[PDB]
Amino acid sequence: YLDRKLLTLEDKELGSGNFGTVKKGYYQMKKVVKTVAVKILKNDPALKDELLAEANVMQQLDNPYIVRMIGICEAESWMLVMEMAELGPLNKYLQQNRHVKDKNIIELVHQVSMGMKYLEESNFVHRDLAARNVLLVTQHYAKISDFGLSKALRADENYYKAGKWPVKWYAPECINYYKFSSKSDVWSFGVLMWEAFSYGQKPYRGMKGSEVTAMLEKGERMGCPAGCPREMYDLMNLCWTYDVENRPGFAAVELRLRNYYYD
Numbered sequence: 001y002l003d004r005k006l007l008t009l010e011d012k013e014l015g016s017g018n019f020g021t022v023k024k025g026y027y028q029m030k031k032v033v034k035t036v037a038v039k040i041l042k043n044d045p046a047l048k049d050e051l052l053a054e055a056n057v058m059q060q061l062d063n064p065y066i067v068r069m070i071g072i073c074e075a076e077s078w079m080l081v082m083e084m085a086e087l088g089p090l091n092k093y094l095q096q097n098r099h100v101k102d103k104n105i106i107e108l109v110h111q112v113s114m115g116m117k118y119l120e121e122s123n124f125v126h127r128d129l130a131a132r133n134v135l136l137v138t139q140h141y142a143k144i145s146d147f148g149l150s151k152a153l154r155a156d157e158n159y160y161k162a163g164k165w166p167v168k169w170y171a172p173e174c175i176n177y178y179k180f181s182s183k184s185d186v187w188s189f190g191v192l193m194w195e196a197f198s199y200g201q202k203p204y205r206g207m208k209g210s211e212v213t214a215m216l217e218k219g220e221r222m223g224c225p226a227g228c229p230r231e232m233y234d235l236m237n238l239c240w241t242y243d244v245e246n247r248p249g250f251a252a253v254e255l256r257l258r259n260y261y262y263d
């Protein structure tokens with residue numbers, strides 16, 4: 001829990017969602033002043049639980065490619081205070097910056113894969129991995145964010161059995177059997193890659209969720225984005241392996257990206 005006196009907020013608003021608004025601020029750590037992003041709950045038991053589940057999860061996470069939580073501050077409102085990733089969501093950035101080179105995109109997605117390999121080792125599932133939920137520190141440093149749908153897996157289980165339903169990022173076992181695992185997160189990571197190489201274009205455009213599900217069961221997949229290296233498109237296809245058993249884990253995904261990047 002944070003000291004409201006040690007927090008200064010801008011008057012400007014960075015963004016707003018169902019939960020409320022987001023403001024940029026500063027929090028005085030012992031000596032240094034650290035720039036922060038803050039979710040400020042508008043005015044709702046669900047939203048408080050949402051903020052609470054995300055905080056509960058972040059508190060246990062510690063990795064260079066995952067957004068770091070500073071803490072919670074109870075004052076004029078409930079506040080979730082994170083270290084600021086200044087450049088914001090990966091999709092919106094690439095949408096405004098098409099000069100980004102393929103090798104730069106590969107670097108950022110490898111970084112995500114490294115954060116997810118950590119998440120997988122830590123036995124947490126993200127359940128909302130998408131380009132909108134990756135934040136940029138700099139043009140060469142990505143962090144995974146938005147852990148509101150995330151779950152710590154029980155010590156005796158490999159998956160979580162299941163609100164917000166981003167079906168275009170969901171593996172078939174999620175849609176058909178409500179089972180969410182690190183391998184489901186791998187499926188989503190494939191969609192994320194596609195997004196990144198499509199410079200933030202939405203996947204499966206013009207299609208309803210049921211239509212995407214039909215497409216995938218037919219064995220059809222999204223095509224290679226313009227200028228996307230083939231090796232990276234091949235990795236998207238591996239991530240979209242239908243049968244979860246045979247879908248690769250994040251260790252193999254991260255390895256594959258590393259070798260392509262450093263070679």
Ligand SMILES: O=S1(=O)NCc2ccc(Nc3nccc(N(CCO)c4cccc5[nH]ncc45)n3)cc21
Pocket residue numbers: 014015016022037038039054067080081082083084085086087088089135145146147
């Ligand atoms: O999308 S935006 O609001 N509009 C422009 C912009 C520019 C920079 C950021 N950066 C940022 N860094 C860290 C955390 C964070 N947020 C707010 C966005 O969800 C968080 C605060 C509290 C908890 C959180 N979990 N995941 C992100 C996040 N934002 C964000 C934005």
